[PDB]
Amino acid sequence: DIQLTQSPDSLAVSLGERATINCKSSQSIFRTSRNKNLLNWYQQRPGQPPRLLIHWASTRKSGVPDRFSGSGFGTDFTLTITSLQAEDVAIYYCQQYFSPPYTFGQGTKLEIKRTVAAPSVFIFPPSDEQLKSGTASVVCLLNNFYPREAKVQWKVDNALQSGNSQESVTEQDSKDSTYSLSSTLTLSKADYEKHKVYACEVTHQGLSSPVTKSFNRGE
């Protein structure tokens, strides 16, 4: 099997700047008879199928912007992206088409660097319908922030919570380069009904100081 190693694994590049992604093949993938290095580059945007950018190491597929260019010979290949756009947020994969199995690199995850953007914070009490079932889910939403790093603490009657929440984060948006994040606090109905004040405290670079959103159970 031919092994392809990409570097780096993660790359953060600002809008308008240049990204360099390398692919090292464990053996030559130059087919003499076709006079081609049989390397493909793909872009896979969040929640989308892969898109072919380049084949034969340096031939751009019709409709792919000239911002994308492939170079290299033998075992060392490079994808260069000039004038980085918001819509370039993706994982980039190299693949050899020289000898089966037609192996992929491990991928390079491209982050778009943009200006700091504070999250909008929203809290949602559990629904009456859910409380009937014996469980309380409290949700804290951090909407459209940058960068990714964010701290979310749950406080119930000012007791800091541990072990009883899960976070989920969107991929960077293709247009505004922001993240959104959900923190869900799960309590038994009984535990929920023993406390009054439910609070979500958010720390992020874009905020002057931590922001708290809270509600009083039954108000």
Binding site: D1, N40, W41, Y42, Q44, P49, P50, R51, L52, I54, H55, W56, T59, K61, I91, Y93, Q95, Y97, P100, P101, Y102, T103, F104, G105, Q106, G107, S120, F122, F124, P125, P126, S127, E129, Q130, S133, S137, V139, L141, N143, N144, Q166, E167, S168, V169, T170, S180, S182, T184, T186, F215
Partner: protein
């Protein structure tokens, strides 16, 4: 348009068998190599198999050789992957792709989940907008306690797409998935505009339309 459409994916017991189909249109099917590639959700592309134009040459990744069989029906414009003796490590989105210079015109993919766990439909709960972000309100749906993936969430039957965030599912301590779909809208719309999340969990035949009302 070149169109590839994968089907036949779903929940299957370890040791079981599945047959994926890829329906090809908008090109001369018998003129091109065809490929299967898979991706474990949140992981990388793994090449699985290909066939030449007539199906006289085929190859397979090491981890599936002897268990999977690629084939094609050039008369019916269909590629197949027969998958036998399935294991947990075969759980992935399976893509078909047309070979030209590289792999092109990838389909949306079909999810294969190899698990002995039971199908369970989600409970859908509203995330209601309340009397407070200035001119912007958030609302949503909590889609809780389902197996397997995936669930799809649309808003107002696909008419509301701006400001929608459907979060990745988290696996809970129970081994059931949970996710939220949220949307930000003008506060000005809350009094007059109806907001309904359309949740579909096809593996359990669970379709829910949940109206989310300001409270």
């Amino acid at each position: 348009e070149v169109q590839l459409v994968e089907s036949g994916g779903g929940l299957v017991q370890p040791g079981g068998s599945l047959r994926l189909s890829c329906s090809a249109s908008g090109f001369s099917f018998n003129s091109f190599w065809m490929h299967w590639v898979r991706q474990v959700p949140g992981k990388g592309l793994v090449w699985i198999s290909f066939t030449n134009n007539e199906g006289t040459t085929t190859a397979y990744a090491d981890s599936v050789r002897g268990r999977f069989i690629i084939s094609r029906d050039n008369a019916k414009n269909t590629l197949y992957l027969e998958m036998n003796n399935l294991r947990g490590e075969d759980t992935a989105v399976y893509y078909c792709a047309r070979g030209d210079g590289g792999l092109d015109d990838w389909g949306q993919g079909t999810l294969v989940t190899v698990s002995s766990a039971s199908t369970k439909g989600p409970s859908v709960f509203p995330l209601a907008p309340s009397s407070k972000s200035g001119g912007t309100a958030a609302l949503g749906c909590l889609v809780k306690d389902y197996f397997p993936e995936p669930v799809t969430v649309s808003w107002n039957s696909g008419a509301l797409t701006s400001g929608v965030h459907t979060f990745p599912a988290v696996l809970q301590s129970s081994g059931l998935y949970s996710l939220s779909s949220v949307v930000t809208v003008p506060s000005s719309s809350l009094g007059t505009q109806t907001y309904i999340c359309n949740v579909n969990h096809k593996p359990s035949n669970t379709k829910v339309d949940k109206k989310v009302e300001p409270k």
